[model samples]
Target: LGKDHEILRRRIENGAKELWFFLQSELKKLKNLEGNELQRHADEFLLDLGHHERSIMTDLYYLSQTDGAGDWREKEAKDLTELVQRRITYLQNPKDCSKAKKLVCNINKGCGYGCQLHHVVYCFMIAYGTQRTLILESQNWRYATGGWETVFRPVSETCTDRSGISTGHWSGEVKDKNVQVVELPIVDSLHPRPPYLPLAVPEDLADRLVRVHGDPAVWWVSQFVKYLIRPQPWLEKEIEEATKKLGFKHPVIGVHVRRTDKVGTEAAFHPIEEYMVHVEEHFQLLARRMQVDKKRVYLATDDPSLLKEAKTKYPNYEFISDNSISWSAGLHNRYTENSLRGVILDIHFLSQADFLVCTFSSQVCRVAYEIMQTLHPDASANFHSLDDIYYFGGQNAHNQIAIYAHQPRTADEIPMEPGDIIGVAGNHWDGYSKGVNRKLGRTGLYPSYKVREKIETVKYPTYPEAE
Candidate 1:
């Protein structure tokens, strides 16, 4: 949106003391523009595009640099700047693999959130990449968005397009001749908008899903979490032996009772004793209906002392502890238990279970959901895709069962513009993007639903501007 950007600047209501805003209606139109935006922005706009560009860059710089895993911000900025103004030659080359830090040395070498960031980056750098042009729309001067049109790469270039902007999407068309619009026709019935309930069935049928277990993306997307359902042959053998020793049988139901910062009330966790009581409630429900002789209850917990003491309380029901298992991996900044062993073990253990009880730790359940799909293709019938679990079960409903994770501040309590880098929230059990919306996501689930909270222009200054 280069030349087009200047045209839109004429619309801003620049002031000496106050920050002005582009009315949403007028803010919709600009160069290469289409959609309700033209009709919507029937009035003048007051927003600036500078805020958008600067904030985006600042975010990329911090995200790419802090982990020390990738200098992608530098590389991407270099490429984008060179493409835009031909003033820099930094990212014109491939990623500098030599820069990855020690901890995430391997991951930093790859990409994040299905490589979406890389896709967004490529939109600015490629030869036909959208030019940062400001334009005047209804007397407003701000940058016009290239929209999805900026994604000139085609899907055919899948995998080969290091940027993940496929060659098959030269025009970034969704399915047909027209770009897909996320149609949000509202009835405006001043009531509650429920979760995926109404949308899922209609969509599933429209897509020809005939049965409860008849969706493909459900099977595949969920393959990430479901992939873990299958037990390793050796592990299965060990399980068989353990079952014999413990006097249990097949069709086990397993749950991990974790004692962490997550286990309490709104402001803080419950007293350890009180928390144990809560954990017991969830367990007792399942235990009441399931057959103890044919069904075993397994515990892979963070607190073995609790497990050991709890065992004495319920000796009639066998509870297996994962104390013997050890994980070698470690967690980073915010994700404390993100070690490979813990993650992988959690995945494997869930796969082995005939039934599962999960919580707000999306990292654990996401991988568990995907692994289950891979291990038991048949079980995919039971759950939606990792994307859908994120879409359906985990969105608003997960809070009912989640130990942590709550909904964000209500729109009434705190009005939010997009891309607000607020702190980690409290009710993590309620929603996705619930935790600190650090850049894109937490523990990386690529939340499928209302996760994409589009950011409005916000000023974030960058240093040296990289020429």
Candidate 2:
């Protein structure tokens, strides 16, 4: 199915060309005939063309299933992911913890699970950059007073101790390697922000990662998330039981609708219909590839009423969601252990689902998308954000390079010369995207198709010792 798919596609493409030429010649011949004769010939030609078109479409549907360089890409992605993970495991567990240089970070941030998780990831990135073991301090965590280890496995098996002979706050330069333990500020306040932050991939693995992943930086960040969020056996069992109970199956689209506190302030409230539109489109595209008997959508939302609403409105599609989980996720019980468990379950299923449709503005959705990358060769494109493009909470500037030059056709549109870089704010999802043109120093709209993302890579510790 791998190479044969490509062969079929080319063959179909050439067959289409031949058919088109035949139609042109037949139409030219029809020009010389009389009224009734010409009409009869044209009708016959139309029928023949229609039959061929239908046959071609059928061929294309099967081709879509067999297509893509997924076989090799999947293996390469697995190898690269394991390589990064092995290095992380090595970095976290030192033979002698007392002498190991450590980065101390607290998981006491007064934010939701997604935000706190990213904070931990930010610290891990710093730890990776500095080649230090990360020591997390998470006592009296809001979600679980028992701390992160209660829900998820500890980051390091052996190096949880934070006591060191010398301690200091993170500074621009870590001149003293002897300083065994250094406390790190949150990503927002980190002084002299390191180059190894989000939107940047490790130089050593960047080439290989970019070869197989659409967004290598996100793939790089996903490794940290993947490592840090390994659920404890109890939590894993909970997730497993929930998944089995729901009968979560393939070709199902995961939809996260963020509401309540986030509605007016952070993101616009998109109704169930807006999310379902994408879900329907996904299934329609999926139908072209294979027989889709049931259109199942795993609905994850804070609002308890969305599941009922989706079910009522889209009667044909099967919507799977836990009403109890949604109720627990409401504003009333948001900070409790129950709510944390609910959110954890939501994110777990969302990431596991084949496709995702959610607003990228919500940390919940962003976390799900980030984790999604780890599960596939390149799941960066497997999401449809109803709001902003995928981004980290505290990331360096995200830019897109113009591959094709563009001239402003209207007042609102901006001009872009080939090779010009644009500091993208967000995509409007119309034919256009909005960004600040670096060359012109003007902020306005431009065609989204004209630009391509600029992959950012920075020099990071290669971990030659682990290798």
Candidate 2, 1-467: lDDT as tens digits: 46888787887898799889988999899989999998999889977786566567666645644655657787899999899999999999999999899999999887888889899999999899888999999989988888988889999999999988899988744564668898988888777787878898888887898788888988898999999999999999999899899988887899999999998988998988888877876676677567898999899999898888888888998888998999999887888898999999999999998899999999999988989999988888789999899888889999999999899999899999989999999998888999999989999999999999898888888787887
Q: Candidate 2 clash total?
A: 0
The most accurate candidate by lDDT is: 2
Candidate 1: TM-score? 0.34
TM-score winner among the candidates? 2
lDDT of 1 by residue, 331-371 (tens): 12222222323434544565566555444333444344444
| Residue 54 CA displacement from its true place in model 1, Å | 58
Q: Go through the candidates in order and give the C-alpha RMSD of each one to the true structure.
A: 26.1, 6.2
Give lDDT per model, in order.
0.32, 0.87
Model 2 global lDDT (CA atoms, 0 to 1) = 0.87
